[PDB]
Amino acid sequence: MHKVVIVGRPNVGKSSLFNRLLKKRSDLKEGVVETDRGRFLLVDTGGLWSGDKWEKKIQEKVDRALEDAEVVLFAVDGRAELTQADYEVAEYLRRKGKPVILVATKVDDPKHELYLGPLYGLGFGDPIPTSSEHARGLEELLEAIWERLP
Ligand SMILES: Nc1nc2c(ncn2[C@@H]2O[C@H](COP(=O)(O)OP(=O)(O)O)[C@@H](O)[C@H]2O)c(=O)[nH]1
């Protein structure tokens, strides 16, 4: 089946997002997402990081996890400012060349969407705002995922 992988630094909300997507209807964490659009294997790579710094050790682990990935969900905090780790994971993803959907997390209220500007420059297109706490943007995220699964 199709494989979708979540990538991002620690504490941006990857496991929470993973859990919401897994429950959706219509070191790795692996789960089958199934809705009326079809099914795919969702993989969270957060457990591959030891600390919050992008390092060769982690990159090599992420590389393996991305082996047969069709789409990457690049998770960045939608409230906190972008970090050196974010910018480094972004460059790694551009180099990898796999389709990337930029996901802004913890966008609990529409007002937070006004402050996602720095995200548009990461080179991945408009970020899709989500909130696992309020279950926002999951429909839009599933639609984007399926537009890229061949
Ligand atoms: N306010 C808010 N908090 C969230 C949201 N998603 C996750 N969190 C919290 O942010 C912290 C890190 O989330 P987590 O999923 O563990 O991040 P990971 O380390 O990327 O898996 C935890 O306290 C989560 O409960 C969200 O959508 N809104």
Automatic annotation (TrEMBL):
Sections of the chain in a coiled coil: none
Domain EngA-type G: 2-150
Residues reported in the UniProt entry to bind GDP: N11, V12, G13, K14, S15, S16, D108, S132, E133
Transmembrane domains' residue ranges: none
Domain of life where this protein originates: Bacteria
Entry binding sites for GTP 1: G8, R9, P10, N11, V12, G13, K14, S15, D44, T45, G46, G47, L48
Its biological purpose: GTPase that plays an essential role in the late steps of ribosome biogenesis.
Family to which this protein belongs: Belongs to the TRAFAC class TrmE-Era-EngA-EngB-Septin-like GTPase superfamily. EngA (Der) GTPase family.
Subunit description: Associates with the 50S ribosomal subunit.
Stated name of the protein: GTPase Der
Originating species: Thermus thermophilus (strain ATCC 27634 / DSM 579 / HB8)
Gene: der
Parent-record interval covered: 1 to 161 of 431
